[PDB]
Structures are given as C-alpha cells and as structure tokens.
Symmetry: D2
Subunit: 397 residues, 4 copies
C-alpha cells in the first residue's frame, strides 16, 4: 500500500442563504477552488490528474449530472480528466477526501483532487411526474434541506424527524441542557470572530469574483455580536419544552472547497508540498431519530483500527450541526465540552455549513490548525442526516 | 500488503421500460429489492458486520434523493448501524460503486460491503429553479428523465450541450461507423438477448419485483434488419442514430457482495471472482461514446493485461455507433464472440445508475457459464468519460 | 324610449363529459367553439357580421379558457373578426349570467343580435403557482384549479370560512333539516328521469356531437356521459358521506366535476325578422341574490323571490322549474323554502346535474335552453331557471314560450 | 308591451394609486386591493343604505391568482358589505373595468336594478404561473407559463389563422400599417408625461385617490409610474422592444401595473333615496372587433358604432379619454377619427404611458377621470375608449349633469 499526502488546499468564503454567493451557480462555485489550485500550483502537470472527487448533497439544481466533471471542465482542466460526485449528505466532502485516499493507497491513482460544493440558496424545487392522466395530485417540494418525497415506510419504521427535531432528541436522550448548548454556541462565535480577525480564515480563502466586478472574500455567516443573554431569549424551534434554537444550530449556506492528494512519487514529480499524511477514514450508522450521535461509532471504529486514542489528537474538528449533538458526541468520547483542541477556530454555528463543502472544509482546516499549533495527529468528524457519522484522521508531515 | 477482494453473490431486478412494468415503484423501494434478496440468498451472513453500502444513482432529485444507498438499506431491513453512500458518474455510477467498494477493502479499511445501483427514469421528477428576485417572471420547469437541464452558458460555448443521441451521431461521423453496421450490431444484440432469455440466463440473475414482474421488458425479439432499416434517424435524414440502434430510458436496480478472504470465511459466502482493478478516462463531451477507450487502455496498461486476454467483454451499448467505434479502436472485431455474448442495452435497456453494476455481475455470470477466466466491463459516460473494471473468476 | 322585447331563438349544447372522460382531450376554447359552429350551420339566414356580441360564462379562466374565452371561441368558430366577445364569471351561474346580460343589452336598445353561452373544461383546469415574494423564496406551492378554494385569503377564512362546496351542502342539510333519506330519494328521481329523457331522445334534440381522433380512426361523442341509470336506493344508502359519518352529502347525492359547452341566439323582434330566425321564448327577466357563504346552496331563494316579486309572477305559475342540482340537500332546501313539493312534477322533469353533471360555466346556459325545450315539448308557457353559487349567491332567470 | 327605459347616473367614484410592477402595491392581494375602493365608497357616502346595493360588477383580466373565483364577490365581502349583496366579474381584458360600468348601466336602464357598484382591479405584480395537467401517466411534457400579460396555452389554430402577436408586436404592426413614425410616437409619449406631471402637481389625481395601507404600517398615496423628467433625447435613445428595425419602445408604451377603482351608478329614484349626488348620465356603450394583429385600432369601430347610434359627432365631446396602450395605436386611432395628434380635449391630464395600466382597473379609471375632467373644465359630453388584446375596442359616452 502507498502513503497518501494532502498538499495544497483552498476554499471559497461561506455565504449566508440568499446572501453574498446566492447569485453564483453551484457548478461555477465548485470551479472556483479548482481554478485556484491551478494558479497556486504551477509545477503540476495538470493532464496527469487521475480523478476529481467532489461531494454534493443535492444534485437536483445547477449541480446536476455529476458536478465534479462539470466543475473540472468549467475550471479549465483538460477534458481528459475524469470526475465523480459523492453523496453522504453533510459528510459528502469528507467522503471525497477519504475516497481519493483509498484510490491512491490501493495503487490505482497517483494524483487527485478532492473537494465539495453546496449552493443551498439555489437548491431547486422538485415535482414528481403525474401517475395518471389529468392527475389532480401535483406538488412542489423545496430541496434546500431535509425531507422531500417522504416514503411512508421510512416514516412508519424510522420516522422523518427534521434535523432540529433529531437534535432535540439527542438533547433529551443524552441530557444536554439548553444552558450548555448556548454556552457552546457562544464559544463558537467568539472563537470564529478571533480567528477571522487573526487572518486565519483569510489563509484558507480564495475570492469569488462576480461579474464593476464584485469580490466576495469574507465568511459572512458569523454573528460576533452574539451574547449569552441574546441566546437565552431565543425560543426553541420545536416548542417550549425543547432546547434547540436558531442560535445554537448551524444554518443553510453556500460554498466550495478543494485540495490535492498525491502519492510520494506524484509529490516529487509535480513539485508539490506534502503537508499531511492521511491515516484513514471510517463510517458508522445510528438511529435516524438521533443522527447527531453518528460520529461516535465512526470515531470509535477508526481509532480502534488505527490503534490511536481520541486523546492522542492535537486537533479535533467536530461538525457543529447543533450544539446538542456536538456536546453529546464529545461527552460520549470522554472529551471536555470546552476542550482546547476541539474547534479552536470555532465551527459551523458561526461559520455555516454548505452540506457538500463542509466535510472538505473540516479536513483542510484541521490540517491548517495542526500547522499553526505544531500538532501531529488531527481528527475531523461529522454527523449525517438519516443516522450516520464519518471520521477521518491525518498526521502533519 | 494490499488485500484481495472477492465478488460473491449478485442479483438484480428485471429492467422495465419507461412508463412500463416498474414505473409505479419508488426508486428507494426499487433499490431495496436486490438488498432484501441478498439477505434471503446468503443465510450465513451476520448482517450487522456489513461495513458499507455503496450505490450508484445518476439523478438523486426524486424519491432517490438524500443518499439513496442509506434509504435503501434501511427499507431493505438491514440494521441501522450499517452506513451507506451514493455515487454519481452518470451511466457508470453502478460500476463506480463496485470499484469504490473494491478500493475500500483492498486498502484494509473494510471487510464486507455491498455495491450496487438504481435508476427509476420513469419517476424522474421535474425541477424548477428558485426565483432570483421578488416577483420574478422567469420561472421554468425542466425534465430530469435524461439529459441536460440548468444548462450553463459557459459549458455550451466551450464544449457544447449535445444530446446523448447527437454525441452518438458525432461518433458515427468522426469514426466512420455506417448506418448498416450500426443496425447489424443492434440486430445481434436483440438476437443474443432473446436467446439468453430463452435459455434462462437472465432468470438466474433476477429477483422478481412484487403483479409479479420477473422478465426484462425492453427486449424486441421480433426485430429484423429490414425493420431497423426503415427507421428514421433521431436527429434528421443526414444522421444515423435511430431508436432501434440505441438503448432506451429504463427502470431497475442491482446489488452484489464484496468481501476480503476473512469475511468470505466468517460469513459463509461463495467467492466467485477476484477484482483486479478499475480505471477512468476523459474525452471530449461531444464524442462521449468513445470514453471507454482511454479507460480500458489505462486499466490494461497498469495491470499488464492485453484486451485480447479477456474471455468476456461487457461493453455498454448506449448506442451501436459508439459500441462499434470503441471495439474498432481497441482492435476487437465488430462481432467478436467474447463481446456482449448475451446481448446488451439495445435489447435490455439501461437504467443509468443500475447499468454498470449489471455489467459487472453479468460478466461474472458469463465467465462461470463459459469457464472463462478474465472479464472486462466498460462503459461510456455523458459529458465525456469512460470507466473500466476487470475481474478474474476464482 | 321604451325597452325592447328579447327573444331566445336557436340553442344547442355539447354532451356533458365526465372528469378525465369523453371530452377530456378537447381544449376549453375549442370546446366553446363547438356550439358556435353548430349555430352557424343551423341558422343560415343570419348575416353573421351583424352579431353585436358573444357573451360567454366561464368560472375558471386560468387554462386554455384564459384571456377572454368568448372572443377566443368566436374566432375559432369561424365568426368574423369584427364580432366582439366578453366573458362573465359568477362561478356556477356564469352561463345564466351570460344569457341575462345579453338580454339586458338588447332590452336597453344597445344591441339587436347576440350569442350567449358558457363553457367549462374541469378535466383540463390547470395548476397555479403564486410568484415568489422574495429572492430565493422557499415558499413556492402549486394549487389545483379544478374546483373550489385556492389562494385562500386569511380574512375570508376568519370572517366567512372557506367551507368546501360539499361542506356547505352538509351545512344546508343540518340547518334546513334535510335528511339523508330524502336527499337519496331526490338523487334517485334525478337518475330515473334523466334515463327516461335520454331514452326518449330528449337530450339528443339539444346536442351537437363532438368528434374525437383515436389511433385507428375518429369517433363521435353524442351522449351525456355522467348518467348512472342503474342507480338504486340500496346503492345510494351504502355510500359513505364525503365529510364523515355524522354528515349526509355523498358522491351519489351530489353533482360531479364535468366538461361541456352550450350557446344560444338572442334577438330583438327586428333582428328575428331580418335574420330569418325562429323566435322560441321571450326573456322576462333575471335577478341575483346573496346569502352566507357557508350555506351557499340556499342562494336561489332570495334570487327567485326578488325576480318573482318584481315581475308579479308566483312561483306556482311556472310550468317548468329548472333548479340546479349541485347537491340534493340544497335542491330540497330551496324547494321547501319556496313552498314547492320535493317531487313536484314541474321541477327538473328530465332530471338534473346529479345525473347529468355540471361543467360550471356551461351549466346555467344549459338550464335556460333545457327549460325552453321542455316548455315546447309539454306545451307549457312560463319557465324559471335558477341555481346556487359558491361563496353564497343565487341567480334566477324567467322566460315565456312564444 | 314594454315600459320606459330608466336614466342612469354615475355618482361618487374613487381609485387606488397605480403601482409599478413589483413596486408600491406589489404586496397587496388582488382581492384585498379591489376591496380598498369599496371601503372608501362606504366611508364617503353615509346616506346610502348599503343592504340595497343590487350588484357589484367588477372587471378583471386574469382571474387565476388571488383574484380567482369571482373577485367581485370576494372583494365586496372583504370590504364589509353585507353578504346579501351579489357580485359578478367581467373579462374583456384591458376593457374589463369599462365593461363593468356599461353592464351596470344596462342593468339599471332595463329596470332590473336601481343601485349598483361598478369597478375593476388588476394585480399584475402578483399574477401567478399556470401549469396544464398531464395528459398521460409519467408525461415528460409539463410546462409553467407566466400570466402577468399576454399569451399562454397557445392554440395552434389561433396561431395559424390570426397569429399570436405580443401586444407590443401588434403596436409595431399598427405603426407600420397606419404609418405612425417613431418621432410622432415619442412626441405623444412626452406630452403624456408632461400633462400627467402637471395634473399630479395640481392635486388632480389626489382628488381621485384613496391611500392603500401597506404592512411594514405605511401608506401609498401617489401614482408611482410617472416619469416627469422624461426627455425626448432619452426617448430617442431607447431600443425598440421587438428589434432594431421597429418603433415601439418601453418609453412610448404603457406598463404593467397594479390598482383598483370603483364607482356608484343609480336610477333617479335611487339617487333620491340614498342621498347621492348625480354627477353624469350614462349615454351608452358600444364594442367593436378588428384583426388581432392590429388590435390597437379596436377603438375606431367601437367609437363609430356608439356615436352613430347616439347621433353625436366625435368633435362634440368636451373630453376624450383614449387609453394609451401604445403611442402608435393612440395616434392611429385619433387620425382615423379625424382628431389632431395633440388635440386639447384628448387625455388633458395624460394617460397610461405616464400613469400605467392595471388591465381590469384601467377602463373604470378612464370613465371616472373623464367625469372628473368634465367637472373641472365645465364640459358637457365625455367619451372614454380603449383597445383590447385579440382585437377589440370598447367606447362609453357620458354627459355631466
Ligand atoms: C361530490 C364529489 C366530491 C364526488 O367526487 P368523486 O368521489 O370523485 O365522484 P365519483 O363519481 O368518483 O364517485 C365516488 C364513488 O361513489 C360512487 N357513486 C357515485 N354515484 C353513484 C351512484 N349513483 N350509484 C352508485 N355508486 C355511485 C362511484 O362509483 C365512486 O365509487 P368508486 O370510487 O368505487 O368508483 C365531486 O363530484 C364534487 O366535487 N362535486 C361537486 C361539484 C360542485 O360543487 N359544483 C357542481 C354543481 S353546480
Ligand atoms: C413594454 C414592456 C414590454 C416594457 O417592460 P419592461 O421592459 O419591464 O419595462 P421597464 O419599466 O423596465 O422599462 C425598460 C427600460 O426602459 C427605460 N425607460 C422606460 N421609459 C423611459 C422613459 N420615459 N425615459 C427613460 N427611460 C425610460 C426604463 O428605465 C428601463 O431601463 P432599464 O430597464 O435598463 O433600467 C411592458 O411594459 C409591457 O408589456 N407593456 C405593455 C402593456 C400592455 O400590453 N397592456 C397595458 C395597457 S392597456
Ligand atoms: C434519470 C437520470 C438523470 C441523469 C441525467 C441523464 C444524462 C446522463 O448522461
Ligand atoms: C374549473 C372551475 C374553477 C372555478 C372554481 C370552482 C368553485 C366554485 O364554486
Ligand atoms: C394580468 C393579466 C392577464 C391577462 C392577459 C393580458 C393580455 C391582454 O392583452
Ligand atoms: Cl438534508
Ligand atoms: Cl462543518
Ligand atoms: Cl448497460
Ligand atoms: Cl345544472
Ligand atoms: Cl388607461
Ligand atoms: K465512501
Ligand atoms: K394538488
Ligand atoms: K445471480
């Protein structure tokens, strides 16, 4: 088996729903980090790229019909380069990284690109075909996030809880208080505001140019103005006996990210800078109704196989779909609610979460943080709608 | 060291015609059919040990939305502890599921996996972009059954947005594939498929969908050369691709088990073939049908296997023009006996996400019947790709 | 300075098709044109460039009936481009409102020769989708226009409710004490009388056929499709109410959802003479009434009382009453309020909408033409046609055979 | 033996401001918008016994959106009128609101009614999209169509025989066939803007208007479409709608707009009973048809029909309110009727190029504004006339009391 190295990595800013990136087609948005990789890495012979693997949760809109291939062509990569799109909802972009890793480790490829995209602003409506002539039963459904075309058998067996309902279920089952959720959310906002001011995100970001030209360069989901008092006043999404609010949850967002992965031979050939070795990826399943706890079996599976303890990681990038689930996962894994190595630059409550891009962001930001801190091993892990988790481990070199 | 990977049991639904026998069956329910059959057929498996379900699906806007692999495993009655992920390389999605499952086991990250694919083209929805302004007068519905929607002007200007049949006409023109040769190939597909269906070959691959649907519906066994000759080309009288020398739009699902040697033992599986490798290739979108050529060359060069060494070649028949052009470029006769011996998608149809899984499982099936050793499955991909996967009977 | 007498002359209609049935393939504008084409063929003395106006009723106007179907239909029918058209909407009463509006135009001296009619293709009624009220709105929705509420105003719901038409008919059954048994008996008489009229060739005298293309050749639709002549009291008794076990309105004691068109000529005495028409009845007058939306089926009562008080005609003086049968509960309630027996011989002698169906815009025109037809066959003198209207109205129109 | 026709009087009249597409009134449902002038008539006329209103006649060209299912009746209920009052909706496209007035007149004249309300509404901002039903299971042929203005669900037989020219295409056809120059069209457009600006500044429109309340609440008080600073240079620079060889521009055409209007009509006996002020007698209405492809010339046969029957010359009118769908057709109509392009009695306060034209509301506006102008000027007879899509015209004559 072959060592696999993450090399350059870059992302767009993350836009708010209907905000700074809402006019940018998903395929064009995916192409932005690909074009930046080309510009940033002039020693690469681009016709040698073996594959572009991209995560995308939707695929009904301008991201239809294999957005990985659409994006590589729009980015100016040669038509000889193949592309494939992966869908594990919020974990899609991490699955692109781990799939790229397995292709190189198994000797099938040498040089690849992995990343992800989502334009939740531009997610379309969908309408099933008529099932009879002159049918009176036509319906439009929003694909921005969550259930559509509900199967009655899925509802009867597993339920079709909304994402916030699942987060309330985790809060109840794992006993995560509203006060702790809000404290976690505030720390995310404070840490993200500090990282933004320090120029940490700027080092990850390439601008999006929109045709005078408008240039989008800053993550705009952040709410640095957040106070505990303001969080406390919010009403829960699902009623007064519940805990999840708009303030202790991520949002729906737009963005894309990409990075290069390479064998040792490809690193040398293409003049790349190897930044981390990929150690491995593991997935896990849980009940849909408590999907937020999905990371726990994934992390345990990966760490047990690699012979690494959770405490051995110098950074943990844990997706913040909801504070209730971030906290429940940390507690289950034996990590403090405010452990210093967890989400040190904040996370999705502040930054937002374009589903397909989010997992690629967690890997690239974990690597970035290992470089800043001089850490060795990093873990990125996230929950998945309909009850999964994904975990991926890297080691700085 | 890398780990050997074995394909074990494999099963599929029949392939239904658009609006036909399977049109009432939701894509998620359809995907669950072969998964439930793998449970029934493999009594020694401890199902909570399955590491992953990988499924191909080209659409994902309809009842196949939000990661159909995971939806399908839950509907099939598999434990909720089992993860799933959905792959999209258009017509090659199901083959990509197989090769992706292979790489996961080969690299030591998994031991027992299911790979498959689904498409319900009958039930593909319409899509409507959001309004870009309040009171927008510019709202539009687009069909997602097959082909371009939400066309990007930059894609059109640089690469074109040729329909799939237009790309097949382009291949016929550029590679000099005559109408007569296309029709001869189509007739052989129908003849061979009708023979295989009479011999019970497809029946050995099929689990019924419950009215019991048990037979592939797309076959036209009555096809004659005279009948094909009369047909008018899709794109006008100067062109060559017709409805008779092209595949169709179809519904179906397929799945198979892959396992390490240790998992084969533990779960009482029957190892049937070793997976040798997978490769992908890119070509100009406008001649997408030629995509298999760089994929096959890449795979064979890496493995050190000549194309002539394969005892079966399962080449997707999206169009006779591209099937023929691919064979000619690879130095294989238009009617070579090892190519599509039981016919192909012209006769059988091609639900996009399921097709590539069908090619792998039917190649293996054919090796078993014939006593052959190495098999190659390969197919073209819209927007200009190819994928190839090689196996070896145990 | 005096008003002018107004005569109804020739009148014709398509058959009435079932939803999704015999006429479902026919665009609403083309369907409206069918009776217009028949009037042209049937009345060859008319100088067609003299027609002052075509008035057509249509309740929907969102589909192929959009943008003034009266004018679309007259052009499709081959009438001169010089002929104006206008479309009226009083829901189920639209076609009757077309007749009365044509009458008022001639009575007031403003016109001499007109066509009045109505159309509905409920099979082909489209879906509607409001515009986005913001960029990237997540709140887009489709709504069926086949029948009943869409784009509900919360202020309408809060003040008057948005009861479905069958719910209003249950409200009438409750408030006016009309039993399930009586509703089903009325429905059975409608079916029996319509089956008898069909067998007698009565409907055939009113109908122009519609030609339809099939794969192997053409067919003609010549018979009303909605009738259920094998209806029995037992069959009706077994049906479940639309709105739950404590209710009374069923699919069997209500009209349906249907397709059809009708049209007729109205003319001054001078126009009858000039154009070689055959005058058949004089129009006496039209009146409208309003009631609570939640009991819309009782709407005919104020309309009939208003018209008859003004004309000085008792309800009992009419030799035919054509009362729309939207629901048996409301047909019965109206008769009871007006002092007419539930089975009075002069009411709906050839059956009504429970048997025949009710394409909204066409229905009111049908009631007028069939009342006149029945007067001619029976030797009767005065006729009354009246019908209820969604959102709480009634309309009534009286005629007298020449 | 018939009795005597009854004289019919227009009494109070009122309108909303006219909003731009997606502009000041875009948030207001058509049914609620229609109710605004009805509520104002109630407030303005306390002598009326409202349960005596025989009918509310309203024009509306669309009827697919919040104006569905007989907007006249919807609006009268929303306005607080008793549930005993009937309502009916008329559709002659851009002439609907005028057809409501004339239909109300005929109902009173023929003795069938005594006290009625006539008006019209359009919310073109909020006009919905429409989608035909599937004709077959798993149909691949589903389509959305905009109902804001103009053709949808095109019939191939209509297209083949008469064409399906857009309204601006018809206006180009009129420019071509009637020889109306781009320069003349632009000059007409400029005079519309100048006259409307002067009228607005003089408080003339304010006398006709009731404000609309908007959720935020704020009020909308003034017509939004006017471009008072319009120059000929700017008009000259505009590109034609239909391509470089044509003449119709956005600057010499009406717009797409939102608004509602209503007025009271009454017999002499009702005027007395309800303490109304009779303001004009209605003399008559006539309609006419022309080729769809040149629909803008529709007013010519309607005006000729009406004036011939009444025995009034076009030159006898003290005001002519001619709808300005397009300058090309406004000019072509005047020329055919022998009236100068800039005749002082024509549109003295400007027209739809400046003010806009919510289809169902526009014809009611023309009638009420013609009456207003007769009062201001001391004139006697007024003519209101308009063109209609798919080839019609409508004309209505009044006489100040
Ligand atoms: C009342 C209404 C809801 C019924 O709709 P529906 O259920 O689709 O009507 P159907 O004709 O399919 O009848 C329903 C069932 O009752 C049965 N039924 C109806 N009339 C029957 C009869 N006379 N004898 C026996 N069975 C009868 C039908 O056969 C059917 O049974 P099925 O489903 O097994 O075939 C619908 O017709 C409606 O909305 N009508 C009101 C229209 C209106 O408001 N305006 C028109 C009057 S102006
Ligand atoms: C003619 C029509 C197609 C134009 O629609 P539109 O293009 O959306 O109109 P706009 O208001 O945007 O005007 C278009 C442009 O011309 C400019 N323009 C219009 N009038 C102008 C003037 N007087 N001075 C300067 N510029 C002017 C606008 O500012 C605008 O510039 P921009 O769009 O680049 O910013 C449309 O108004 C229409 O269909 N009207 C016909 C109505 C009809 O058939 N019936 C109603 C009357 S009965
Ligand atoms: C129903 C499948 C939608 C995917 C698009 C089809 C075109 C692929 O080549
Ligand atoms: C097809 C008709 C649409 C009009 C709405 C019908 C409801 C009337 O009571
Ligand atoms: C909003 C109005 C819809 C009616 C169509 C307008 C076209 C008339 O010429
Ligand atoms: Cl989701
Ligand atoms: Cl995240
Ligand atoms: Cl295939
Ligand atoms: Cl009826
Ligand atoms: Cl106007
Ligand atoms: K994976
Ligand atoms: K519906
Ligand atoms: K098998």
């Amino acid at each position: 088996m072959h060592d696999v190295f993450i090399c350059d990595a870059i992302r767009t800013p993350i836009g708010r729903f209907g905000g700074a990136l809402a006019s940018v087609r998903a395929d064009d948005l995916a192409a932005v980090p690909l074009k930046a990789l080309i510009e940033r890495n002039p020693g690469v012979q681009w016709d040698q790229v073996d594959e572009v693997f991209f995560g995308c949760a939707n695929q009904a809109g301008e991201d239809n019909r294999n957005v990985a291939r659409m994006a590589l062509l729009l980015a100016g990569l040669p038509e000889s380069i193949p592309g494939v799109t992966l869908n594990r909802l919020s974990a899609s972009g991490m699955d692109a990284v781990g799939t790229a890793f397995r292709a190189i480790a198994s000797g099938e490829m040498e040089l690849v690109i992995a990343g992800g995209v989502e334009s939740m602003s531009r997610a379309p409506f969908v309408m099933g075909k008529a099932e009879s002539a002159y049918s009176r039963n036509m319906k439009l459904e929003d694909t921005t996030i969550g259930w559509r075309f509900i199967n009655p058998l899925m509802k009867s067996q597993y339920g079709v809880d909304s994402m916030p309902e699942t987060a309330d279920n985790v809060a109840d089952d794992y006993q995560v208080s509203r006060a702790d959720q809000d404290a976690f959310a505030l720390r995310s906002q404070q840490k993200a505001a500090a990282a933004q001011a320090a120029g940490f995100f700027a080092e990850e970001i390439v601008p999006v140019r929109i045709a005078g030209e408008i240039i989008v360069e800053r993550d705009e989901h952040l709410r640095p103005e957040t106070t505990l008092e303001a969080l406390t006043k919010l009403k829960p999404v699902n009623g007064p006996d519940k805990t999840v609010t708009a303030g202790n949850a991520s949002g729906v967002n737009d963005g894309a990210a990409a990075m290069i992965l390479a064998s040792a031979a490809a690193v040398k050939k293409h003049g790349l800078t190897p930044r981390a070795r990929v150690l491995g990826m593991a997935s896990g399943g849980v009940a849909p109704r408590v999907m937020g706890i999905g990371p726990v079996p994934a992390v345990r599976k990966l760490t047990e196989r690699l012979g690494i303890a959770v405490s051995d990681f110098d950074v943990i990038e844990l997706n913040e779909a909801f504070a209730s689930q971030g906290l429940a996962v940390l507690r289950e894994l034996g990590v403090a609610d405010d452990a210093p190595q967890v989400n040190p630059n904040g996370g999705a409550i502040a930054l937002g979460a374009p589903l397909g891009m989010s997992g690629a962001r967690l890997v690239l930001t974990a690597l970035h943080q290992l470089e800043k801190s001089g850490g060795r091993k990093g873990l990125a892990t996230m929950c998945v709608g309909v009850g999964q988790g994904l975990a991926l481990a890297i080691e700085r070199v």
